[PDB]
Amino acid sequence: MLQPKRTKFRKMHKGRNRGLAQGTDVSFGSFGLKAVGRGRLTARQIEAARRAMTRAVKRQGKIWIRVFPDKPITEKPLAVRMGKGKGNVEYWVALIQPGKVLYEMDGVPEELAREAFKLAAAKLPIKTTFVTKTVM
Amino acid sequence: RNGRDSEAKRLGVKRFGGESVLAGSIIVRQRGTKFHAGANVGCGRDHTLFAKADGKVKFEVKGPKNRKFISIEAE
Amino acid sequence: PKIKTVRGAAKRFKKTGKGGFKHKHANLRHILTKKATKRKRHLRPKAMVSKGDLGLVIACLPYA
Amino acid sequence: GIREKIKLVSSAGTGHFYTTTKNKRTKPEKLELKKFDPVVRQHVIYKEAK
Amino acid sequence: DKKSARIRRATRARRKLQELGATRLVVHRTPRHIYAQVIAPNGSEVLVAASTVEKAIAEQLKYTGNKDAAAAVGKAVAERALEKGIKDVSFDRSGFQYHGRVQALADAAREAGLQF
RNA sequence: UCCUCCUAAAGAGUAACGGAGGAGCACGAAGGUUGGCUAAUCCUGGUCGGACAUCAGGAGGUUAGUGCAAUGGCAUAAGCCAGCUUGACUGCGAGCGUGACGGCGCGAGCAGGUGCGAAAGCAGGUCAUAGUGAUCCGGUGGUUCUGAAUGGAAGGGCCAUC
């Protein structure tokens, strides 16, 4: 359950998810999962995907998480009228743009890497693709 | 427990570069000194910049710190 | 019946040559220690009634 | 607002006076500033008073 | 640093004279050969200079860099400025305390016609 | 009610029971001027003394400080120290900013009389932006301005102030 520590402000504006991803290349491992769609990932989804791969690889190799939530999201309690101030913070999400690399991995065969990432992508709400580290 | 705010102070540049002004007219309203007084320009107690002579106002960057200056040339 | 002048208005506005009105400034009665001399000095002379509220003044004192 | 208001009376016979504030708790002694009196058009000593 | 402290000391005065826009008499002092210069308001040209470094003025005083030297230079700048035409100037300490040689130079200059 | 930031879409302004914080002061000095000075944090040596007192040197260049929340500004320092002082002065005020208005703000310069400096010069409160309340009624001091037959006075007016 990734979450920041002592953030400057409890609440922040909704904002927008326009634009294009920055971390579009593999930088740590040899294989990675790239985001094709656009959306937001909650902390729970990131944890679920991480657990799926660790089990798949059987604690062999290394796992890199290239996304952090660092964005609180509020939700009004049930049977509450509009207004009366901003809602309380419930969960943290990370905004994902197309081309963003979600997870990176190294130290395992390419064949075993594909199934591990496929299992993780099955527990994410955004279209994803498998990429390999490029030479320069 | 929010909901408080202060009336806007309508700061900013009142006269822009290349337009003639009369002596004593306000050129820039500012909290600090974003622009420093140059030639024929005076600085008020609240860091307001006003024209001390009649002429055209121009902006420039001078000094080792590249700080902005406002001057007036008699044209 | 003839119109009745608003007596309160007649004690605060005086008509001038060109139809204007002069009035005393309204911040020089009390609580004067904390005020700068510059602000008190500028409030001493009489001032002309603004255009927006001139129409209101005309109705109040139609005779004077 | 512990600070309270006082009156500075010119040492000359003129009735002109200045008004200011002071804190009696910290500085209980009198105030003897030298200010300008326009009635006589001279700088004279002004004494604190009610 | 002695120079850095001196420049920092005189910066405010130099800026004040610069914006005022007036000819300024600037004096530079060292353990020997006290200098003096007159600068136009723009600060780009020197109207006239004098000092004890040249033989024309160093051939009389016993030693350069004393009270007598300051008076000679202070006097020397005077008639030169009067001959040139400029009368009113602004004295610049240049970060030097206005106590000894600097004061002597200024005193000689003011009594010699360059009132300021 | 007032102040600072964001929302606010690179002039100004701009709403919500939108998101964050403050004010109802203080100071005869913490004001004016003249002269001088330049931090935080680290490294090394050194009694108590210890990670953290004070001393010396070095890196550092303002992450310090700026009476009070925040923003902008501040080395010519607006930051720190000392001498002398009351310009925290009176009558004005070209010309501008800001408001529907009441009003609020900035201001060169002129006259009078002052302080600091050899002098040029600076000073009409405080680094700026909150620290505030119209009118009525009444109190205090000055001023033959008026004072209902006359001379006074009462009461009004004007000025300062509560």
Side-chain angles (χ1 to χ4, degrees):
Chain A
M1 280 289 274
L2 299 185
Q3 192 189 321
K5 298 184 288 293
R6 65 181 294 276
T7 187
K8 272 204 295 191
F9 304 98
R10 304 193 297 142
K11 305 152 164 83
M12 74 174 51
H13 286 348
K14 192 201 300 309
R16 294 286 181 283
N17 207 0
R18 281 193 63 197
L20 183 63
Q22 186 61 26
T24 48
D25 52 33
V26 177
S27 296
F28 303 94
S30 66
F31 315 113
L33 192 68
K34 196 170 268 187
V36 173
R38 183 195 310 283
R40 61 182 64 186
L41 310 170
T42 74
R44 316 186 85 65
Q45 299 163 7
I46 285 152
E47 182 65 26
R50 190 198 59 71
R51 276 211 270 282
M53 294 190 273
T54 289
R55 210 178 307 116
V57 304
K58 285 178 288 201
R59 66 177 66 83
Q60 305 310 318
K62 200 85 170 296
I63 307 293
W64 282 278
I65 323 301
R66 297 280 299 289
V67 293
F68 205 80
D70 63 358
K71 177 166 205 304
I73 300 294
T74 64
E75 190 277 331
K76 297 296 289 183
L78 188 153
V80 171
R81 298 240 171 82
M82 305 285 84
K84 282 75 174 175
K86 188 75 178 292
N88 296 115
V89 177
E90 298 278 305
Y91 57 84
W92 302 72
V93 306
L95 293 168
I96 308 299
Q97 290 84 27
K100 186 78 166 189
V101 177
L102 294 174
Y103 303 74
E104 267 183 38
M105 182 179 72
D106 163 19
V108 298
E110 190 277 331
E111 294 293 328
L112 183 62
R114 192 73 65 92
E115 294 293 328
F117 278 130
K118 185 175 183 293
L119 290 153
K123 300 174 181 296
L124 292 176
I126 62 170
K127 183 65 67 65
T128 46
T129 174
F130 177 96
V131 289
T132 174
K133 160 163 269 293
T134 61
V135 62
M136 183 177 177
Chain B
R1 68 180 65 252
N2 304 311
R4 296 170 303 287
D5 213 351
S6 57
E7 190 276 331
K9 291 312 193 258
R10 291 131 175 81
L11 306 167
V13 185
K14 304 289 159 187
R15 292 313 218 290
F16 294 89
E19 79 188 71
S20 80
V21 298
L22 295 170
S25 66
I26 307 303
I27 296 145
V28 168
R29 285 270 306 290
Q30 46 179 7
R31 286 276 81 87
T33 68
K34 291 174 70 175
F35 314 89
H36 292 263
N40 302 124
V41 171
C43 199
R45 59 170 296 284
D46 71 354
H47 308 123
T48 299
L49 275 66
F50 60 95
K52 305 228 292 185
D54 291 331
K56 299 298 293 295
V57 65
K58 67 182 290 294
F59 297 71
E60 69 275 16
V61 177
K62 291 174 70 175
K65 292 181 181 179
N66 300 305
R67 42 186 57 211
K68 294 181 176 67
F69 279 87
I70 290 148
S71 296
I72 297 169
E73 69 275 16
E75 304 299 321
Chain C
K2 59 176 76 176
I3 307 170
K4 289 226 179 178
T5 301
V6 182
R7 309 300 295 149
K11 292 172 191 172
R12 301 169 165 94
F13 305 97
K14 293 317 188 272
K15 186 178 177 183
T16 45
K18 279 167 148 45
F21 292 102
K22 61 164 172 163
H23 70 91
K24 184 166 191 273
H25 281 294
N27 189 359
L28 183 63
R29 282 301 203 206
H30 61 116
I31 309 170
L32 299 174
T33 296
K34 61 171 80 179
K35 296 184 170 88
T37 305
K38 190 166 127 193
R39 168 155 72 126
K40 293 181 285 197
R41 199 175 48 239
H42 274 96
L43 294 158
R44 223 184 283 129
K46 308 296 187 296
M48 275 279 147
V49 174
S50 179
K51 184 178 184 293
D53 63 358
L54 212 56
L56 291 151
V57 166
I58 299 298
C60 289
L61 61 83
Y63 268 107
Chain D
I2 62 170
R3 207 179 180 75
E4 61 86 20
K5 308 171 285 178
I6 62 170
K7 188 208 299 310
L8 271 71
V9 164
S10 70
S11 66
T14 61
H16 184 274
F17 56 87
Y18 287 100
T19 187
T20 183
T21 45
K22 75 177 287 186
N23 186 11
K24 297 290 179 68
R25 281 75 178 272
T26 300
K27 299 298 293 295
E29 69 275 16
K30 288 294 190 173
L31 201 61
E32 274 206 23
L33 284 146
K34 186 180 289 293
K35 311 200 81 67
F36 175 82
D37 187 352
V39 176
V40 68
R41 294 179 66 188
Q42 295 297 289
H43 276 81
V44 289
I45 298 89
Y46 276 64
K47 303 302 208 56
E48 172 187 328
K50 180 67 174 66
Chain E
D1 175 326
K2 292 177 70 68
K3 294 292 291 322
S4 172
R6 201 165 62 78
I7 301 299
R8 182 254 299 161
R9 255 196 300 271
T11 291
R12 192 198 263 291
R14 291 257 180 77
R15 297 273 76 74
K16 169 63 85 180
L17 282 72
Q18 183 66 41
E19 61 86 20
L20 268 182
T23 66
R24 59 177 215 270
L25 183 63
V26 65
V27 298
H28 185 247
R29 193 213 64 180
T30 62
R32 293 180 292 176
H33 304 286
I34 190 167
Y35 309 72
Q37 269 178 321
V38 177
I39 312 285
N42 56 65
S44 64
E45 69 275 16
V46 178
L47 277 296
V48 65
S51 46
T52 63
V53 71
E54 69 275 16
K55 57 168 69 60
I57 301 299
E59 83 296 352
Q60 299 300 128
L61 73 165
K62 182 166 70 175
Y63 169 53
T64 75
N66 56 359
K67 302 288 208 68
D68 182 10
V73 162
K75 186 180 289 293
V77 176
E79 69 275 16
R80 290 236 181 86
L82 307 185
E83 190 277 331
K84 182 62 65 68
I86 62 170
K87 181 61 66 64
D88 63 358
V89 286
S90 284
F91 193 76
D92 189 358
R93 314 189 294 103
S94 293
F96 298 102
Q97 203 67 338
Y98 180 85
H99 176 271
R101 273 153 78 194
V102 175
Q103 184 178 2
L105 188 153
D107 285 342
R110 71 177 74 247
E111 61 86 20
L114 288 187
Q115 85 305 341
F116 45 67

